[PDB]
Structures are given as C-alpha cells and as structure tokens.
Amino acid sequence: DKLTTDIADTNVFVGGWQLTANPHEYCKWRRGTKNEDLVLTDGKWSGNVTTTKPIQSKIWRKWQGENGSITVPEYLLDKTICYNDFYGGYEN
Amino acid sequence: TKLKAPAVLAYSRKINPTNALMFAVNWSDRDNTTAVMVGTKTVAGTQSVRGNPNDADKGNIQTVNFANLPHNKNTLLVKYNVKFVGDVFKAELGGGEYSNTLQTALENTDFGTLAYRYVYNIAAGRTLWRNRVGAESIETVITVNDQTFTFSDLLVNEFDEDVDVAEIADMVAGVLSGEGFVTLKVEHYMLLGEGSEVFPSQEFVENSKLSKQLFDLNGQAAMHDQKIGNAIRTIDTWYEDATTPIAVEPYGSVVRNGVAYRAGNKTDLFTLMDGAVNGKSLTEEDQMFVTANLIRGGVFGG
C-alpha cells in the first residue's frame, strides 16, 4: 500500500513529478527526526548532558569514552539526555 | 523458647569522650598552651584522577583547611575527657526479657581485658590518628580520680602488660562491670617538631568551597568525639584471621578497607547475641566482643 504500481507523488513509478521537486521533498531519503548532536569533547560534554553513574550491579563490560558524539532527537534535547558510560541516553 | 530481640532494642554509649582539643606546647614547657588554629590555605594541584588522562593539564587550584603548629613550639597537646559509664547491660530503650538474658549471659565476661584494651588505646595514644606520624615521643598523661599516670611510647597494636594501664583499668573495669562512672582527663604530648602540620578531624560538607574542612571549636583545631571514641574501641583482635585490632562494630566493619571483618562467617554481634540469650555457651573473646558492642552502643533491632 506504499510501494504500489502507481505514480502518486511519493510513489515508485513517479512520472511527471520527476520534473518537479516533489519526489525529493515529500519522499525524503533517511527521513528522521530533527536530530541535533551533543558532542563529547575530551570528557567534557557540550550541551545539556550531565554525566551520570550506572547501576554497577551486573555490568560485564563497560568501555569508557572521551571523544565522539551522541545523536539526540530534538524532542529529548528539552531535557538532559544524561549520558552515561554503560547505557547512553535515557529520560531521568 | 527462642527470644528473638525487641525490634526497638538499642543500647547507649558507655564510653563517652569529649571533643579532643588541640594546643601547641613545648616538650619542656607543657603549661604554656596556645590554641592551634584551623586556618584555610589555597592549593594548586595537578588534576591527577585515576580515569581520564587528558585533563592532567591545567590547575586543580582549590582551598582547603589546614592546622599547623606555630614555629616557636614543637609539641602538639591533645586534651580530652573520656567518661566510662556503668549500667552497661541494661538496655536504654530496648526490652526487659532479652536484655536481662543477655545480662546473665555476659555476667561472667572478662571485663579486665576489655578495660585494659580501652585504657591501653587511650594510653598508647591510638586516639591520635595521623598525629602520631613522625612523632619523636608520645607522652600520655591520664588523670583519673586525682591520680596522674604518665605513659611513654607504648607499642599500640599489641596490648602488652603495663602496671599503670592495669591500674587505671582496675577502676575502669569496676565501673564497666557494675554501676557508677569514671572520668579520665587525657593529655597527649607528641614532639611533632617546630611547625609541623597536625591532623584534626576533617568535616563532611556538600556545598562548601573548601575541599577539605577541619573540625574546629571557636577556630581552635579539634578532633571529633566520635573519632576519639572510635579509637577507644579499636580492640577487636578476635575476628577471623586476626592480624591488627579493628574497631568494635556489630559486623566488624571498617569503612576504610571496604570489607566487614565479621560479616558472612557467623562471627558478627547479632548471631552471637541471639546465641548468648538463647543459652548456648559463648567463648571468652566473643563474650568480650558482645560486651564491647553493648558498651559501644547501637540499635540492635531490625
């Protein structure tokens, strides 16, 4: 019902609309959420991150990180993503 | 049978020390005492934590509290009063069946060894904690019911036989076995050297600007009474694989080493206490341990 043999506008047989910008606007490749990137720079986080401590009950392996970046949706940017060494992002 | 415990059962502190005030004296002139003051100094460190090495750069730079002897006197004096109190087997706020069966259970305990280890921890200067580090000579003056006892450097981890420690422990055991009380005014003289940094009790703080804050009373350097009292009951040499005396605790628990020395091997206070009430025979060292926890105090409820 989405990959049908029609042309529609966001469909697959698209004809007539290739001339327009419609199949590249309404059918977006890797359509994701806003996605801002909170970046860890040498152990110091950029935005509203606040490093936390995991439960240390059954962790087998936990690797630490100092550089890199985490991809946070704009919805969860409102609150602190609370990055942690064991499990990355959550709501707390 | 099987008297379990009162859930409310608690015992009070039978060894009550005062806050150990610190003064600066000379080794020859011990009467001219001057208040060692807790000042604050600022400090530039190197930010050396175990984890991330990439913040080893830039300063650590924070303020802490310090207490040094002034550079005209070379001896640290520590003043406190330790009050041993009797009625040790009565529960202050616990029940009246379990408490009296525990009283009859520990009525034949060896109070002499208990009192000797307490008076030895007082007289060997174990109430001094890091202030003994680099001391030429530790002279302990214990005045008890108008009787002055002077002690030189005694070996602390072993409770070797001394006749003056046994002399004070005679009235301390007479107090602890029955009713009444006794007071020990204890003055420590350690030749720390002119200007040596002393170590008063540190404080627990959360939002303070000081990274380390020392305990003070009107600015004078002082030790916590709970720290001194913890060093009174560092007599436990009766746990499993005993090497050094640890503090008397219901679980033999030392916070610093992070391992409880009497938990998990059925040598804690509560199992022996329930056994002593329920009528199985206790050995002498664990009887002394249970009595030491009773005179330490604590809610043994649960």
Add this chain to the structure above:
Amino acid sequence: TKLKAPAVLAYSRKINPTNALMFAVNWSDRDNTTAVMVGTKTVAGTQSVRGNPNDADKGNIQTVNFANLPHNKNTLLVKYNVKFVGDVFKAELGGGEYSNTLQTALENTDFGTLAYRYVYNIAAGRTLWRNRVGAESIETVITVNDQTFTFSDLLVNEFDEDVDVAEIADMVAGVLSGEGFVTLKVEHYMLLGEGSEVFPSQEFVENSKLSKQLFDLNGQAAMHDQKIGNAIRTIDTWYEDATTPIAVEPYGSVVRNGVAYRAGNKTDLFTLMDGAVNGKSLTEEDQMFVTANLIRGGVFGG
C-alpha cells in the same frame, strides 16, 4: 587476575615539610636571624573588569605586597623541617587487596636512589626557586639526628655524587623502606646581595582581588609546605623524553608548562600499579616512580 583497583584507594603524604620561614642574616653573622617582613605598598588605579563596565569610573584601591631583604643584611635564610615517614606502602583509605599486592610488588624498590634524589633536591636548592637565581653563594645546612651536613656547590639539575647527601640518604632510605620517621632541619643561606628582593610563595588571588599575596606566617614571609613538597619529589627523570627532573605526579603533569609527560603514553602511575598487581615485570625506574607516588600519596580511585 584482573585485580580491579578500589575506588577509595588513597595514600598518605610521606614527605611532610613545614612552611619555609624566611629570615635575614649575614654571611659571617649567621646567628643573628631577623625575620623578613612582607611590606605592602598601595597602588592607585581604576578597575577594569569584563562583567562590570559601569563600575570602571571609581574604585579598586589595591595594596600589593612585596618582600625584600633589609638594607643591612645580605643573606636570606630559609628554615624548614622535612619529615620523611616510612611504610609508604600502607594505604590509609585503600585497604589491602590491592595495597598488599603493591607492597609485594614494590619490595624490590631501590629506596637508596629514591632517597638520594629527595635529599639532593633538599640540599642542592630545588626548594629555593626564584631566590637561588642570581645568588653568588649557595649554602645548605642539614641537621639530622644530631648530625650537621654542609653543602656549597651542588648543581640542582643533575643528581651528581657527593658523600654528604649520600650519608643522609642512607637513614632516609632506611626510614622509607622500613618503619619510622626521620627529620631533616634544613636551613638554606643564600647570599643574594645587600637589600636584594626575595621571593615568598604566592597565595591564589582571584582574577581581580589584588595583584599578589606573599605567604605570611604571623607577619613573616614564608613559602608553602606543599610547594616545598613539590620540590622534594622533583626526581622524575624516568618518563619517555626525560630532559629535566619533574615533580612526581600520578600523570607526570606540570601545570605551568601546559603539557603532561606521562599521561596518555602508558607510563602513568595507574597503569603501572595495575600492571604490578597483575604482576607483569616492571623495570626499576617505573617501579621507583610508583613508589615515589605512594610516598607522595593521593587518591587513586575510579
């Protein structure tokens, strides 16, 4: 295996120096010690701050300290007692599942060299940073267990052989390898010249505050105890690309140069102690560095 380090693991400071009190003497009149007073001159100037442009019109009457020699004495005398203490392997907050493995991994430490470099930093003048600069004559007197030692010409950068430092290093290594303490009363006499300006240590001021605080005990110019402790442990010539002795840090980090020499290249203390308690073969120099850190002390937890 995989003996993971305790989070509470810390070691006490084992080289405890006092504050370096500073006096004015002559070169041939060494007994007449007059205390160097920190003078303080006022400077009139308006405030210029980033956060308050409205307050720049009037204010900031600042009064900056200074310390010179008096115009009748040409020699600056620096007195401090360095206290070396033993059992550097005892953790004070750590425990003994890791610290006992460290004891049995650093028992082969040549304390002789460690102590040599400590007493050489004591004697050669590493503890006299900006006031040994430009002095035509340097002298160090060390008094230790009623023994006097005289040092005149020791270049501070390399640890060359002199039997005088070695003599003291013996008893210092015997303390540090075993149990006990030793105290070196160190008096430095440097002939700078008539009325030459001297250099006390600096208290941390804010970005604003005043220009510079010099370190005062009871009005007299002095230098910080931790700053002398930085001088004594400045023995680290065993990191990769070692040009000059740096202060033994857990990360080999100097703040004033903006670089860390042992951080991030597997020669930091923490990887070496985990290698020691997991038992891989250490060389003599990095094991000596680890023992020097344990002498320095500090919390190593994570």
